[PDB]
Design a protein around this ligand. Structure first.
Ligand SMILES: O=C(O)CCC(=O)C(=O)O
Ligand SMILES: O=C(O)CCC(=O)C(=O)O
Ligand SMILES: [Ca+2]
Ligand SMILES: [Ca+2]
Lengths: 414, 414
């Protein structure tokens, strides 16, 4: 009951990998909560404009509204934040997009962004961070960071196979380790809370598979495997050995005369590509000190989240940086940012996060000609300085302009 | 057999907290591996100079050499990287210092820095990061970062209560969760590797206890509790609730009219102090975007390591930033940096990391008058530009100068 399908719209099908993405495709789209009400209105007017413009009224998107979040309480009711039909309409109309997400507190639902990333089984989180030539940069020489993250979504500590301290079920796990597994190294077992971090083989490999199938398909230059896999030496140490086993076996990598670093037989394009590991923390400070020595990064969920949220704001990118989640069973384009209500349904926020996720969407759909026309509207607005609140709260010279006027103005540069 | 005691030196005792730190104290000191051979020679000449100078030949340090590392193979032999007597001479001569550490690979020893942090039970890692007015900064406005980290060392995922994929003992743990604990959410259980992350009560509380006993004893301003405790909501969510329970109960904190933020009855000094939590990743980008809204940070081992290694290089601090580890049973001052051998026993490296750890040492010892005389020698060298390799490989104008000439020159500004 509810979720209307758009008539003339044609559902996207599959074929032998060939997304058979129709002239009129139905693209489902969750609005979000909070600042969603603002940001997504723009994202519609705008994706309507680069298809009315590139394909000259030929290709035209047919948008289905669908839901996770606070908006399925006063659309459903009690504890029903995580519905049935949104989860399958992504998997049926194959490309969907979404804004931000209020999980509650109390009614126990667990982080609704990671929740959809694994109930659909979307392995890859795709977080490209780059710079627009003059914005809000903390850093002096900001222009160096041209990188893209592949962060594994199925596992790691963000998998939260976790139990609360002083609870029933940790009594049962902790004694297993002490009495049946011979473990010391828990220090204060009393009132202790325990969490599980997993890492497996085609799990770290279908993650490194697609990262390297992307360094080749997009003519990118390093694949850095980021891991703290020297203290968690199975999991993060393991990830880095199997990620290089994916590169060992299925991709034919050669040794750079001595050990650790490695090289690829790269097919459709021919250019040589480097495969490395940095430790996670040495890498946090790498991206600042010698950036541009770093390019396609592949890692688990935690470091994945933390390298993006660091790399993002280092490019002064915080208001605008994009996001995508990819399965074989379908896909989801997203805002990296949250619900922000203190500055909320009032139009203050940058809508640019999720407009770059529309761009990425269309990419994927092979509508390269459209998406690119979006990179071309963003380029111009930040250069002519006509910007929202978040860019002069760190910037010089804009005609005071807020949210569905930045939507308008992306199109001004198209 | 071996480890010589210095005669006239008097072993440091305890009393009711009163470190009875003698006029002639024996301070044990591990040299390290690699770049250790260089960095620590300086640290001796230098701590000899601010006691010959502040206390005017009255107080004079009596140095004991002791060992963990590669240097107890060709001092002991096989697999004997982690010896018996170093672990107890820290706990007996109460203040010791150390350089960097080569763990091997193969002979299974596990990270010898975390290994000593928990075999002695040293709860607090103390990582102050600040700036010297002009150095190597990636960031434009670098001068804002005046913060200090308290990172819990007993627990978290860096505790590595971990087992390897395809091994005997993970067959036994994974079936426990599936069959006896009712767990799904492991995604590819076959060839999976599993790790344990713990967090308990007086473990997150003796960690927040000392951080707040330090915001008051040093007249510092925020205590930010950093946690990703929204996806690991026991452990990191738990840490933040019990860290605020330490602040709830034993320190008398009041609510800032509404929920989440909090305030303290602060004794010997009277000034009001704020207690907050940020999520880990929003916090990674905080320290760049609105730094100086952040001050005493308390967190577990992982985020603890990663916030320091980020914050450190953002101040262009990478070659020089200090470190300390504190128990009740004694203490250890340290280099944050590793063995670096490609530029190694040849004198290239900054010795300034571990010279600031000597300063911190002396602090603790109540030899405030000495330690401060060290901050006063560092101030001058970086301002008169006479620096090592690592500062012009990011800097303008130094008389080319390398390592035991920077030792000399700290003293030049005293
Ligand atoms: O939305 C969340 O739950 C975490 C926010 C975040 O920073 C991210 O997902 O990268
Ligand atoms: O030395 C290690 O094992 C980790 C290095 C590091 O960055 C740290 O301890 O903060
Ligand atoms: Ca994030
Ligand atoms: Ca570090």
């Amino acid at each position: 009951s509810k979720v209307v399908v758009p008539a003339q719209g044609k559902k996207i099908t599959l074929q032998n990998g060939k997304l058979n993405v129709p002239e009129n495709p139905i693209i489902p789209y969750i609005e979000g909560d909070g600042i969603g009400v603002d940001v997504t209105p723009a994202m519609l007017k705008v994706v309507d404009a680069a298809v009315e413009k590139a394909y000259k009224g030929e290709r035209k998107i047919s948008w289905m509204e669908i839901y996770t979040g606070e908006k399925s309480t006063q659309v459903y009711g009690q504890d029903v934040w995580l519905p049935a039909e949104t989860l399958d309409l992504i998997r049926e109309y194959r490309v969907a997009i979404k804004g931000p997400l209020t999980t509650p507190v109390g009614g126990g639902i667990r982080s609704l962004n990671v929740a959809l990333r694994q109930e659909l089984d979307l392995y890859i989180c795709l977080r490209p961070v780059r710079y627009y030539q003059g914005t809000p940069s903390p850093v002096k020489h900001p222009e160096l960071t041209d990188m893209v993250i592949f962060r594994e979504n199925s596992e790691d500590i963000y998998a939260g196979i976790e139990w609360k301290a002083d609870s029933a079920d940790a009594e049962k796990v902790i004694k297993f380790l002490r009495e049946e597994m011979g473990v010391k190294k828990i220090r204060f077992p009393e009132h202790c809370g325990i969490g599980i971090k997993p890492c497996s083989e085609e799990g770290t490999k279908r993650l490194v598979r697609a990262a390297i199938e992307y360094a080749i398909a997009n003519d990118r230059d390093s694949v850095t495997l980021v891991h703290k896999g020297n203290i968690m030496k199975f999991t993060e140490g393991a990830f880095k050995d199997w990620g290089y086993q994916l590169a060992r076996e299925e991709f034919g990598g050669e040794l750079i005369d001595g050990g650790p670093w490695l090289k690829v037989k790269n097919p459709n394009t021919g250019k040589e590509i480097v495969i490395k590991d940095v430790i996670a923390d040495a890498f946090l400070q790498q991206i600042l000190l010698r950036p541009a020595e770093y390019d396609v990064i592949a890692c688990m969920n935690l470091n994945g989240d933390y390298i993006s949220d660091a790399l993002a704001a280092q490019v002064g990118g915080i208001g605008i940086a994009p996001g995508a989640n990819i399965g074989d069973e379908c896909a989801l384009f997203e805002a990296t940012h949250g619900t922000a209500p203190k500055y909320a349904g009032q139009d203050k926020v940058n809508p640019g996060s999720i407009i770059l996720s529309a761009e990425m969407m269309l990419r994927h759909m092979g509508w390269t000609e459209a998406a690119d026309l979006i990179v071309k509207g963003m380029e111009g607005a930040i250069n002519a300085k006509t910007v929202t609140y978040d860019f002069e709260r760190l910037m010089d010279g804009a005609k005071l302009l807020k949210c569905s006027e930045f939507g308008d103005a992306i199109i001004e540069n198209m």
